[PDB]
Every structure is written in structure tokens, then in C-alpha cells.
Design a protein around this nucleic acid. Sequence first.
DNA 1: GGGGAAGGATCGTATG
DNA 2: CATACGATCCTTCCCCTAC
Length: 979
Amino acid sequence: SIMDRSEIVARENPVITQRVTNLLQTNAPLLFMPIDIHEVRYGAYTLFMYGSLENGYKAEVRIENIPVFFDVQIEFNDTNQLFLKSLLTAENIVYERLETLTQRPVMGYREKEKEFAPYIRIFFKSLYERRKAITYLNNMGYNTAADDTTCYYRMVSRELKLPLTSWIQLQHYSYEPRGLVHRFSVTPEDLVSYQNDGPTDHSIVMAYDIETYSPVKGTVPDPNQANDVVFMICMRIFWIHSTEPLASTCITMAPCKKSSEWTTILCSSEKNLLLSFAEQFSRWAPDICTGFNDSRYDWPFIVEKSMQHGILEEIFNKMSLFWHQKLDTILKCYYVKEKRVKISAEKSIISSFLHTPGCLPIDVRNMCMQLYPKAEKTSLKAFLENCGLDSKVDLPYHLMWKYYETRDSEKIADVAYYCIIDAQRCQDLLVRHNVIPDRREVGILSYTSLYDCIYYAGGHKVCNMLIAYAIHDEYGRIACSTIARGKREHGKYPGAFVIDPVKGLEQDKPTTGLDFASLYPSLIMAYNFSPEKFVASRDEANSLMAKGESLHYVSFHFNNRLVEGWFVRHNNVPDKMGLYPKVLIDLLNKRTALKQELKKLGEKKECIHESHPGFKELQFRHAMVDAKQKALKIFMNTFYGEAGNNLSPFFLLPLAGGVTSSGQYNLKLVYNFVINKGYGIKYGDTDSLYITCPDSLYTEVTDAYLNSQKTIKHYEQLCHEKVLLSMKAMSTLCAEVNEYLRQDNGTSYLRMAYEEVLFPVCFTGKKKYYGIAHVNTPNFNTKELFIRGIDIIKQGQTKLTKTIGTRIMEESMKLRRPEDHRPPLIEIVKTVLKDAVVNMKQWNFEDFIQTDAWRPDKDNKAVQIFMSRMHARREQLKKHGAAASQFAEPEPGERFSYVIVEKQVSSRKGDKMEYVSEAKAKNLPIDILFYINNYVLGLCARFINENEEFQPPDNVSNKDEYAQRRAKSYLQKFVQSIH
DNA sequence: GGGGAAGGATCGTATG
DNA sequence: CATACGATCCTTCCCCTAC
């Protein structure tokens, strides 16, 4: 009584399935979407594309006769061809046939006459022979183009204009049915990409969750232990873009009540449990598998228990659409172990999953941390609360273990419900964050598969997109390589132009940030930074300068040596434009067009009410345009990172050095121009300059304030006029700066932008500033603060960090008369901290709660001391004949909530720990001083750790974490003094 | 890896 | 005036996630 994928799809959309089968009967062209891409390495190369048709059917399509090739840059001739033939034959490499052609080298500028270079293309039958031949030819010093060595489906995506994450049209195929999967065989000239907006996708995502058991109480279950078992396997199948359950199931050992919302299958053993899981997987055939933290606890434990019982081979072969495979191949090539997934520049994750062909695995946790690289709490509850979704049901783990042990068939239904809701929340997060469409659009722009957009970094994607744009081209097939060459020199680039910030509470004149709009791509656009326009020899550069060519000179100090170079300018002619400027200009034009389209779609969505039967497609188009513009942004902001990476094939030290030096030169020019115009400089950071208007421009506006009744409302009037005059003057300042830049570099791709006005403002140090933000009209009554640098977004251990950090900032940023004896930042911190300490009643009890875990095997000192004190108290109460029921020990692994209390005359954390129930029973003081000292002063020290008094002497090595110690000690002394 | 709690001697310094 | 306090350098898990 189990319903397979075909019947479910037929039940969902009958008319679409009828149209699909009518098209299939007549062998008409149809539509396909790939999700997981698998390729065979040995033997004849056939590329398998797994995915879904437009109704929801599972389709495998194999692309036969893909041309497998790579290019070598030698002079084409009979003698050279014979020599290369002998070289390939001597090291027993099987070749198919050879071709000759002409291509443009990517490194080094050449004139028009010598623009093309001869290349010989080697055709091959298998990928293994190609990899051996490419290694042999690279070891002999020959140059190699179209030289991908890791994955070859990127070659198929690049050469054929065939995105592997977008729709593909099947024409002239060969259908063959084998049940739940439909097999097509296609010739690569019979495949085309679907240009316009495709229909609604109908892929299937299976969200699964596992609940386990361990005889050793209070310890996380471990796969290696023999007694450790899985007992709940709960999984649901959803659409790619919906949260409604298509079909749900629970696979169990312990008896459970029949439920009308999901199907429960009873298994008498763990082996039968795993086989039932595999059978339901095979019957449903997910396009995508998912689950929260499934690559670190779920899949390893499943595969370890499958290996222990010796059923891994049969489970894999039932769950995979590929042919039969043996256990060694499954453990070697398909079960990945210790794979590294990158979040940011300093964070990496270890993941392990079973990549069965026909289904692509995604961790919800990996996407959640990729979208929020600075997230501090990475639990499911934390992400659910941040994203504003329904939280998990309150079921403790020890209660689950106890109810499993009692074998009570009635209430294991609650355990199943908890596991199914945990499965639901994963795809709830996936739909709410719109991860899969964003990855699809990244793949469309990058010509990669979805697997690469999920588990690989974006730098390789940018490199792939650049190669894809280069190889097609409009002016003659620019050829480029992929593997890196030359010595990977390591060093530090020259430092940025440091501008000393004028620290303090600036509330006499407004400041405003002039920002370079996409500075590094703009300099790449303007100065024609491309590898094929680079000249290294000085004599060649002089010869080009002789024949009426415009060049840009770059010179920088790297590793104590002078690196110099010349770049050929395009002179505002698209024919002479380089590869990087062409790619960036195309991406910027696309971004502008989609910005216009998104504005029109948003206006239409605001116009059209939700009751009309057209809101779904409008929201769906809005989702596509938002995803597309986000992908365009993430590729455009990554060009400099890929250009500066040493491992990149396109890496060129003059290119990165010239980009940095040109940014330096333009920032210096803007700085000098602004100073010579009379304006002031407050802060400068790479691409941003904060400008303060001259005093004289305000004079008349100030004069009416001095001759008035001199009241408060007069001062808000003064501030209002101040902001208006600042905006009006500095818009013209920005226009003149743009005109000067255009007159300097000769192009119009480098412009400045007027982001918002900051008044009053506070710069506390390097990359640490805040203030009131004004966008078009002044509003000083707002509670929204423009913040950068200060880590106010930190829940930490208490909510007092939030409250006091906000209160300091708000007390600093209000308007004050020039006759109210303006206190500096340190005095404001002093008075707000005194107000916090003295006025105890302003706080509530719930902000003083902390949570901890009681694990009687770990050497957690404070928890050990608290539990020892509680045990001593319980023994003392029992000796006195007192029923210490609410003093009882927690169950092992059970989280408990505590507070800190005053202890009259140790100072350790443990002796002040008390239970929440005990604290509310006795109404004890909550010892605000300890909380303030250990949690609030960390943030409060960030505000005054650049003052003159808190400075190191000259004879000290460490300069960063050496003044905050004195700041914290000074605040400690002040807090202890105020009593 | 980055922050949280806990443990020890001696110089730096002070006082009845 | 020689003891007693105290803070800094430095060292060791523990929490983090999933049960």
C-alpha cells in the first residue's frame, strides 16, 4: 500500500502528465531539468544527466559521443604532428585523431598581425587516457589549453552553451522505459538550452531525520559502538518550491500507533530498518536529499551501520540509478569522507555523505552558515528563531530515551511527530532562504553543475565563467588554460593609504561617506586590466608608445623587488577591449537591466492585490529576478579575489599589483582634490572617504541660531538646516569629483556615490564608527543606528550586552546644545554604567538566565563545583530530615537553567550558581556586579580602547590586545568604586 | 579555532 | 620592614552541532 513516484506525480498534476505522455508517444521535443550529474571515467565517455521533466517524472538522459579533446600550443606541421604522435605512442597513450586550428593566447599582448597562434587538438576516447596524456605533456614543458583535469562536464557546459542547472530541450531522442525512470540517449548536437522563462519546476526534495539511542546514558550515540542503534528514520518528499507534504513516512523499531498524517512501517531489526529506508528511497526516487546536519551525524552513522551488517552494497545498489557496483567501489569513489566545505576566508567544515547517483545531497546547516557566515549559534532552533519560523516541539532527548526504553507504544507517536517536524523544518528553511534557485542561477551564470554550486567555492566558478566567455568570443576564439603554472610566489602587497581617523564624538559638523561604486571592477574596466593586453618588456612598451598606442604604467614593490608592467588601453573602442573589461561590462549591463525589471515588477506587485489569480506567477518572477541579481552581484564582487589568487590559471602579479596601485592613485587624487577644495577628511578606508563640509558654508545658517531665543527647538531647526545644506552642497561636490575623475582617467566607469549623511557621528578607532543615518530627510527621533565595526549583534551569555551597548550609543548620539557641557564618550560610558549599577530594579529576571549541560564525564569546572555544592546541600538537608525534592540532580544530558547570586563573606563561578526555581523561591539578589564585570565590560571596552591614557609604551611587542586590558581594569575599578 | 572558567608564583607595592 | 593581596604570563579542557 505504498505509492510510488509515478502515481504521486500523476495525482498532483494530471493535465501536465497527460500532455507529457502525449508528447512522449509521438517522440516530440520536450523539456528536461538536470539536478545531479554523473560521468563515467573509464571506457567510452558517456555523460549521465539525472533530473525531472516538466511533470515530475524521473529521467536519466545519457549524452553519447561527446568530443573529448585538449589543445597543445605548438607550431602545426607534419613533422611536429609526427613528433607528438611518437611522444604519445612511446608512453602507450591511446589516441583517436588529431586536428589543427588557430587560437588566441591569453597571456601576453600581441599585435594584430601576430594575433593568432597555431594549436593542435588531441581527440581521445576515455578520460583516463586524457589525464595521463595531459600530465605527460605538462611534465615536458609544453603549453596546454582547454586543460581541465578534475571534472569534464564543465567542458561540455562551456563548449555547447548548455547550462546544467537550467532547462534543456530534448529533440530527436531515443526513449526506453524501465519503470520509475525514463532513459533517453542523445547526440550532443541534438541538445539546446531553453532561452526564455521555463515552466514551473517539479523536482522532488526528500527531507529526512534520524533519532538514535545509546545504552550509555547522557552521551551522544557513536556509530563505531556495536550497541548503538538508530530507531527513528522519518522522511518526507516535497516539491522544489513548496512546503506542503506530498508524502511522509516513518520507519521504526518500537511499536507505534497508526497515524492518518503519515505512514509508519514496523521493522524487527536494524538491518530491516535500513532495508526499509532503502526501499522507500528507491520507490520515491528523490531528486535532492536533505536534512539538518546530515553530513556529520546522519549519513556517517547510517553508512557505518550498513557496513557493520554488510548490507551497504545492496542498499547503495537499490538507492542508485546507475548499474550494479561492488562494495570496494562504493567505499572508495562514492562515499566521500572528510570533505572540506568553505564558508568564509577563515571557516571550514568537515562533511561526509553517500553520493548515490540519481540524488544530490544538501546539508541545510551548510547553506544556513553560508548565508550567515558570522552566525554565532548554529543550532536548528537558532536558525528557526532568526528566520521567523515555527520552532521545534519541546521534546527533551532524555525523555525520548526513557520512552523508548519503556516500550510504550502509545507515545512513541510523539517521538515520530518530533522527527517528522524536524524533517519539515529543513525544507521550510530551504524555501524561506531560497537556496536552490540561487544556486541554480549561479550555475547558469557559471556553466557549472549544482554539485559545484553547493560544495565548491566561488572562485573556481568565476574562473569557469571567464573561460566560457573567452572561448566563444566575437573576435576569434581566445584560448586559455585551467591548471596553474609557474612558481607560486608568496608575499604581502604594499599597504593601503592609511588616513588617521579624527576619533571622537563629532557633533558640530556633519560628515558623509563618498563611496567608490565597485572600485576594483571599475579600475579593471577603466585602465584595461586584462592578461592579453599586458606588456612586460620595456623596449616593446617603448616601441608600442612610438606607434601611437596608449599605455598604462604599473610599478609596485613586492618581496623587496620592483615589479613593473604596462597595459594597453582600449581608448573607448570595443574592438580593443580586453577580456576582463568585456566580461565586467556585460555583467554590469545585465545587472542594470534586471534592476529596472525588478523595479517594474515590484511596482506591479504593489499595484496588484493578492486576491487576484495572478499573484503566484508575479511572486515567482520576483523570486527569479532577485536570485539572478544576487548571483550577478556575487560574481561581480569576486573578480579581484580570483585575479589575486595565486592558484588561479589567470594569475598575474602585475595585474593584482596594478589594480591595487591604481586604487591607491585614484584615492590619493580624490583625497588631494577634496583637501584643495577646502573640505575636511575624517576617515578613509580603501574605497570610502568621509567628508566634512567647510565651516563658512554653514555661517548664515548658524547666525540665525545665535540671534534667536536660543532654545531646543531652535537647535533641531539648526540641525535640520545643517543636514539639508550638507546634502545640497555635497551632491555638487560629488558631481565635480566625478568630472575630475573623468578628466583624469579618460573613461566614465569610475564614479563616486553619495550613500548617506552621518550626523552626529562617532569614530572610535580603525574600522569602528557609528551615527544617525539620513537618506533624504533628517529624522533624529529614529531608534535605528548606523553601525560599523562594533559587534553589537552578539547575544553572548546575557541580554545586558544588547541593552547597554544600545544605551551608550543612544546617549552618545542625541542632539546637545553647545552650552550643555558636552561630555566625551568615556564620561557617557561612565554615567550610563553608573545608572545601570545603581538602578537595580530596571532589569527583569528572565534576562539573567543562563543554560548549561550536565555531563558527568567532562571536566567542566563550574558545573562540577555547582553540582558538588548541590549534592552537599542535599546531604545536609537529608541529615536534617528535609525533603529536598527541588534540589534534585538533573538527568545526565538534560540542559538546566541557572542564575548567579550574591554570596556574603568564594569568588568562583560555581559558588554563586543557583537554580532558577530556588532563586524565585527565595527571592535572592541576582549579583548584577558579577554579570556586568564578566559580560558588559567586554563591549564597553571597545568604545574607549583608543584614548590617550590607555596606550602602550614603545618597548612592547603586542599592540592590539594590550590596551584593552587597562580599559577593562579601569572600568572594573570604577564599577567597584561606585557603591 | 575563539572565546569561557579555573590554577599558581613573584615581582610591584603597601602598612600597623 | 617582612610578611600578605593582587594582576599578568602562561597552560588545559570545555561548548559548539545531532542525540
